[PDB]
C-alpha cells in the first residue's frame, strides 16, 4: 500500500545496521494469477491462454 | 564470472574463482563393496540427502568470541537426511560446506574456519562432567566466551584454548581456511568420513566439529552498518546406511 | 491455499560499509521463460 | 463387428434442448447456455461408465427453430433471423448478458448462422493438460469428493445477432453430440442401480436379481 | 503452435452493425456504411498493439436480416430482396444519396445478393503503396498528430436493390473480418491502461499492479 | 516345498507352489526418462521402502461382512515410505500384496480378494456427501455391512453392492484372486501403477482399494477355533518422487 503508482514498487529495500536472520522477501512462483507476476511480459502472454506450462528464469 | 550450482530442488550461486580444501587429499566414497560381505548390506538414500540446507545466518559484531557446530545433529530437523537419521540404525557420509560472509570495501577483520574431528571438550569444573545441551543445541551455534567460564556441567569455553586445552594459534593443522575481508569473503571445505570403524551410530557421536573464530575483530566506521551476516550452507555426500530387507 | 512453490530471501550477515558511503540500498528481480514453454487454448484476456 | 469400441461409443444423441428469445424483461432468457458433460444423458452415461479412462474428441451440430409470440402484431414482413454460437474453451471468459464484452473475445471461437440453411456444425479435439479424461475419481478437488479439474471440457452459448429494439421471436435450439476417435482403459462393471443426480455415484440399495419358485424350477417345455 | 502469429491474430469476429430503410424521411436512413480500420474493436486493438508493422490480407462476410416494420399495412405477398455490398478503395467516389451515380462506377467492386442464400463474402489483397502499415506513427499527417495517409483501406457500403416506390422494409447487416496472411514488425509492450477514443493513445494513469498485504506475505498451503 | 524372501531387513516365508497374478499383464516399472525432460527429473528412495510391511491381522468370524484399505495411506506411518508422503510433492509406485490365512482341514469357507482402481463410494443418504474419516481410518480395515446403513457422512457400505452401486458378483473385472480353504490359503497380486497422469500426489487421491469379502461364511464343529486370521503384507515397488534440487 501507498506506492503502487511510483518507480518504488520495483525495490526491494535492503536495510542498515545487524539484522542477520531476517526475512528479506518472500513470494510464491504463479505467473499469470499471483498480482506480482500478473502484468510482466511473460505474465500477460499466458493470461490469453486456458493451459501452458514449462520452467521459468529468475 | 560467477557460477550457479543446483542439487536437487536447491540452488545457490558461488563465484568462479572460489578455493576449495579437500581435507587430507580424500575425497569422499562408499565403503566399497566387501568389508562385511555376507549379513552386512548397506543401501544409499541419494534422494533429498544430496541438496543444499542453510542454516539461520550469525551475526559478527565488534565483540564476538566465535560460534561451534557439532556434526552431525546439526541437521537431526533437516528433511529427509534426519528422517534418516531415526530409521536407521548405522551410518556414515562426507559433507561439503560454504562459509559466506557480506561486507562492503569500508570493513575489516579475519576470520578463521575450522573442521576438527574429535573435538573432546573440558568441564568448567575440573572435577566436573560436561552435560549433552552444553555441547551443542543442534542447528543453533554455541558461542565461545573472551573470558573463563563457571557453572556446572559448562563447557570451558575461553576462545584461547578453544574449549580443548590447546592453544587456539595451533589449529592451523587441522582443514582450515582464512577469511580476511580485505581478498576473499568464501570458504569451501570438503570434508570425508573419518572414523576408526567403517559405519557407527548418529545419535551418540559427534564425528566432527565446524568452528569459527575471529583473529582480527570486525572494524568500521562513522555511518557503515554495525555488523557482518556469516552464512553456513551444508551439502552431505555419499551417504550409506544398513540395510532394512 | 495455491498448491505453488515459493521463494524467500534471507540476511545471512548483514550489511557492512565503510565511512562516507550510504547506509542502505536496493535488489531488483528479473523474470524469463526458459526454452521449454508450451500453451494451449487461445481465449480471451480479462484486462480490458 | 459391431462389438468394437468404435461401433459401440461413436453415436450421436441429443443432449440439450433451451429456449431463448430476443426481448424479455428477466434477460437471462436473452441467451441459452451449456456446460458440456457426459452425466446429465442416462443412456451414454452408463455406456461410457464401463470404462475408467477415455479419451475422444467432440462433434456438435445444432438445430435451431423459431417462432412469433403470440402476444399481438401481426402483417409482419421480416428477413431471416441470424444467430451466433459461441464456445468457450477452459479457462475463458464466461458472458453475463447479451451485450457483454466476452461476446466479442478473440480467442472464443464462434459461429454465425442464418436460418434456411444446412444446420451448423463444430469439431472440438481433445482438450485436457491430462492424458486421458476419467469417468471415476477417488479423490479430493483440491474440497469436493468425486471431482477433478482435468475433466473441464469448456461451454457453448448461443444468441440472437440482431441489432437495436428488436422484433420479439423465441428460439430453441437443439444439441447433437458425438464422441470420434476413442479410446478406453480399465473396464468396470455395469451400474445396477438408478442414479440419483449428476455429480455423485449416490445410490439406494437394490435387489440383485428378480425372484422365481424354486431353486429348482424350470419352466415346462413346448 | 498456437502461438504462431497466424494462429493468434487469424481469426474472425464481428466489427461493425448497422441498420437501412427503404423508405424514410433522413435519407440517410436509406444506407449503411463503414470504414475498415482495426481501431473501434477493442480485443482485436489489444492483439493487434502488440507490433509495429503488419501486413494482411482482409477477408469480409455479411450477414444479412430483413423485417417488416410495424407500421401498418399488412396482407402482402413478396418477392425476396436485393442488396447491394460496393467496396470503395482508397482514392474513390463516396456516395451521397441512394440514388448517386457512384453506386454505378466501373471501378468501384459491387456484390448483388438476394436473401434465403448463403453469405456474401468478399476477398481483398494488401492495398497500400507503402510496404507495411503502422499500429504507431510518431509524426504528422502534413496537421494531425498520429495520423499517416498509407493506412487507409477503404470502405464499404450496403444498399437495397428495388425499383421505384418500395414498400417499406428494415435491413440490419453485420460484418466479419479476418486478417490472412500476416507478418508483423517491432514487438511492443502491452498496452496497460483502458482506451480512451479510437484515434489517439491517450489515457489516464493507472497503478502498476494491484497490492497485497506485506513483501514477505505467502498465502497457508492446503 | 517352502521358498524364504528377504527385502531389506525383513523376510517372510511362503510356499512355493504359490500362484500370482499381474494385474493385466503388466509389471511395475519406472517412467523410463522423457516425458518431461528439462524441469521434471525425479528421484527415487530404493532404501526402505522395498521392504514387506505387515499391518495387523484381521478375525474372520462366522458372520462377517468383508474388509477394505486405501492405497495408499494404509501406510501413512510406515516408516520410510511414510516419511517420503511428507517430505515429497509428487509420487508413484506399484505393490506386491500377499494375503494369507490360518486354519486348519476341519474349517470351510471361501473368500475374494480384489483390487480395484478409483473406487469411488456412496453416501448413506443420496442427498449427502460422504466424509473424510468415513472412506479410510489408516491402517486399520472399514467393515461392511450385512444390511443397509444410515447416519450421516458415511459410506453406504451394504456388501452386495461393494459401496459403488453395481453387483458383487462380477467385480471379478478386476485383478482378484479366490481362497477356497479347502484347496489354497493364499493369495498374491502384483499392482502397477494406474492413473491418468504420470505422477501425483499422494494426499488428497486413492489410487486403489483393496478389498476382502466372504462369500460362503466361516463354518467349524465342536471345539474348533471360532476364528480365523487373515494376514496382509505389502512391498512398495519401484517408486519415485520428484527431485529436490
Keep these: ?58 | 564470472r560467477v557460477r550457479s550450482i543446483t542439487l536437487g530442488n536447491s540452488t545457490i550461486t558461488t563465484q568462479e574463482s572460489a578455493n576449495v580444501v579437500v581435507a587430507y587429499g580424500r575425497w569422499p566414497e562408499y565403503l566399497k563393496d566387501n568389508e562385511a560381505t555376507a549379513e552386512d548390506q548397506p543401501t544409499q538414500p541419494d534422494v533429498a540427502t544430496c541438496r543444499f540446507y542453510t542454516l539461520e545466518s550469525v551475526t559478527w559484531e565488534r565483540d564476538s568470541p566465535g560460534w561451534w557446530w557439532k556434526f552431525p545433529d546439526a541437521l537431526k530437523d533437516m528433511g529427509l537426511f534426519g528422517q534418516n537419521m531415526y530409521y536407521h540404525y548405522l551410518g556414515r557420509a562426507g559433507y561439503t560446506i560454504h562459509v559466506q560472509c557480506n561486507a562492503s570495501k569500508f570493513h575489516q577483520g579475519c576470520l578463521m574456519v575450522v573442521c576438527v574431528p574429535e573435538a573432546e571438550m573440558g568441564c568448567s569444573q575440573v572435577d566436573g562432567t560436561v552435560n549433552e545441551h552444553s555441547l551443542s543445541e543442534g542447528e543453533t551455534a554455541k558461542k565461545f566466551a573472551s573470558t573463563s567460564t563457571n557453572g556446572t556441567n559448562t563447557v570451558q569455553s575461553i576462545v584461547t584454548n578453544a574449549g580443548m586445552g590447546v592453544g587456539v594459534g595451533n589449529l592451523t593443522i587441522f582443514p582450515h581456511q582464512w577469511i580476511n575481508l580485505r581478498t576473499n569473503n568464501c570458504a569451501t571445505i570438503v570434508m570425508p568420513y573419518i572414523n576408526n570403524v567403517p559405519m557407527d551410530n548418529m545419535f551418540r557421536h559427534h564425528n566432527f566439529t565446524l568452528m569459527i573464530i575471529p583473529f582480527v575483530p570486525l572494524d568500521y566506521s562513522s555511518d557503515s552498518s554495525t555488523y557482518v551476516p556469516i552464512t553456513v550452507t551444508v551439502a552431505p555426500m555419499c551417504a550409506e546406511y544398513n540395510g532394512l530387507r | 491455499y495455491t498448491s505453488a512453490g515459493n521463494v524467500t530471501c534471507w540476511y545471512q550477515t548483514g550489511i557492512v560499509v565503510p565511512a562516507g558511503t550510504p547506509t542502505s540500498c536496493s535488489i531488483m528481480c528479473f523474470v524469463s521463460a526458459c526454452n521449454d514453454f508450451s500453451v494451449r487454448l487461445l481465449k480471451d484476456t480479462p484486462f480490458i | 463387428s459391431e462389438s468394437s469400441i468404435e461401433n459401440f461409443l461413436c453415436r450421436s444423441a441429443c443432449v440439450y434442448m433451451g429456449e431463448y428469445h430476443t426481448t424479455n424483461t428477466d434477460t437471462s432468457k436473452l441467451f441459452a447456455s451449456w456446460t458440456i458433460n457426459a452425466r446429465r444423458m442416462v443412456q451414454m452415461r452408463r455406456k461410457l461408465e464401463l470404462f475408467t479412462y477415455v479419451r475422444f474428441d467432440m462433434e456438435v451440430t445444432f438445430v435451431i427453430t423459431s417462432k412469433q409470440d403470440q402476444g399481438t402484431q401481426l402483417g409482419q414482413d421480416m428477413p431471416p433471423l441470424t444467430h451466433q454460437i459461441m464456445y468457450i474453451p477452459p479457462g475463458g471468459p464466461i458472458p453475463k448478458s447479451v451485450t457483454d464484452y466476452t461476446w466479442q473475445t478473440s480467442t472464443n471461437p464462434s459461429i454465425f448462422w442464418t436460418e434456411g440453411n444446412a444446420p451448423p456444425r463444430m469439431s472440438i479435439p481433445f482438450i485436457s493438460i491430462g492424458n486421458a479424461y476419467s469417468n471415476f475419481y477417488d479423490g479430493w478437488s483440491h474440497g469436493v469428493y468425486g471431482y477433478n479439474t482435468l475433466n473441464h471440457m469448456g461451454q457453448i452459448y448461443v444468441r440472437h445477432v440482431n441489432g437495436s429494439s428488436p422484433l420479439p421471436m423465441t428460439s430453441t435450439v437443439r444439441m447433437y453430440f458425438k464422441p470420434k476417435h476413442v479410446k478406453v482403459w480399465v473396464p468396470r462393471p455395469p451400474r445396477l442401480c438408478q442414479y440419483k443426480n449428476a455429480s455423485t455415484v449416490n445410490f439406494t440399495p437394490t435387489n440383485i436379481t428378480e425372484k422365481r419358485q424354486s431353486i429348482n424350477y424350470i419352466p415346462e417345455t413346448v
Excluded at chain 1, 539484522?19 to 522477501?25: I, L, P, R
Excluded at chain 1, 500478473?38 to 500477460?44: F, I, R
Aim: no cysteine; proline share 3%; aromatic share 12%.
Design chain 1, 1 to 58: 500500500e501507498g506506492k503502487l503508482d511510483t518507480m518504488e514498487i520495483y525495490r526491494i529495500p535492503v536495510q542498515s545496521g545487524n539484522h542477520q536472520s531476517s526475512q528479506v522477501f518472500g513470494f510464491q512462483v504463479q505467473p499469470g494469477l499471483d498480482n506480482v507476476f500478473k502484468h510482466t511480459l511473460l505474465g500477460e502472454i499466458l493470461n490469453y491462454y486456458a493451459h501452458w506450462s514449462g520452467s521459468i528464469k529468475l
